[PDB]
Design a protein around this ligand. Sequence first.
Ligand SMILES: N[C@@H](CC(=O)O)C(=O)O
Ligand code: NA
Ligand code: NA
Ligand code: NA
Length: 419
Amino acid sequence: KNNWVLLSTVAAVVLGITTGVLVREHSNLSTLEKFYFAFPGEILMRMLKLIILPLIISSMITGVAALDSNVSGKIGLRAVVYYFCTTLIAVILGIVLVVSIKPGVTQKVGSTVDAMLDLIRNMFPENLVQACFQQYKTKREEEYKIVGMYSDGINVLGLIVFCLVFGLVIGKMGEKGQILVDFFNALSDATMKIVQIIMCYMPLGILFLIAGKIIEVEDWEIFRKLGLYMATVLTGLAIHSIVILPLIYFIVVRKNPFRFAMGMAQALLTALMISSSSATLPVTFRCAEENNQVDKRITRFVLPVGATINMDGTALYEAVAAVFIAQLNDLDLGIGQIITISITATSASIGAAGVPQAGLVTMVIVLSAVGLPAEDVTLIIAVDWLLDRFRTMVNVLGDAFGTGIVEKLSKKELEQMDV
Ligand SMILES: N[C@@H](CC(=O)O)C(=O)O
Ligand code: NA
Ligand code: NA
Ligand code: NA
């Protein structure tokens, strides 16, 4: 006998790939019947979006309140240093692989500052209740006048920053704020038993979410016409996730880095099918502390920050595809043009959201920094549901890897706290 959570997810990926392929050659469903066929996949998607509001709020508060305000200053320093030393590696390895393969040659025919100041405008929102379901976006229009309105989508960057300050303030209050530690420890425990309820619906939801995703129009543009560009994204996503990311784990932890990746198989295959790192963040919490036994004082702090900051698969896909877009023209892309690609792609992966297809929002930022037009992204929009699924597994794995690396780097400080 074995565990039924992972063996039924693998059985639902197989039964969902073989369903969304067979119904195309056999039948011809209309545009309205292809939306009701993926309806159990939509219910799973909005059941996971539902739970990230009490999960991020309660884990960010009790993750920092359990540390005595100077241990948390070094867990926070060893997290941002790790996130910068993997994003830059995933950018550089995607830069080297895209100018040596050269996928874009002889196949051509076939508001950056306003987007970066919206990261700081979203870290300090004007309302806490409005930050739970609405984001702030700035447009420039008329000699121009800056005017911003409130769009939709949960402001995850503003709830992390406020609960980090709320977590530090509560932990320094002592006995005067002990009832707020017990409230958000009982809330983080109650909204992890709900994740174990959604995890029983997940094989039935994936089986229709991935069958209604490969049910699309043309399998020829993804395969051969835009071919050998996906052989630079998936190649860079392979070497970074199989070789490089279990080499950063093996250097600082001598504890078998593929035993950690095998123990995170539920969170890896969830993001491989739902294509959103923020929505699978409840799966990453459960599949790390229960399987790999990484300490709860670190995963409550490292994993929510890494889900919206550390996005290595997006950082490699930004550095590969923006050069490939410039390679469809006859641009030289000299030594000055390479480094400015590698700089804004590090910031675009930071500014990218954990929503599905957030990959093409921040592609305008890196493309306009090199001089390419924004409407030259329309060549990439065709195959984006498949390249978004492999760059979310890597993003999730990177976050999972961080929990184990920061824990061995701070084994003394966790053992410092005693009775
Ligand atoms: N939802 C995707 C967005 C992206 O491509 O960055 C992810 O988290 O990986
Ligand atoms: Na990173
Ligand atoms: Na991430
Ligand atoms: Na990000």
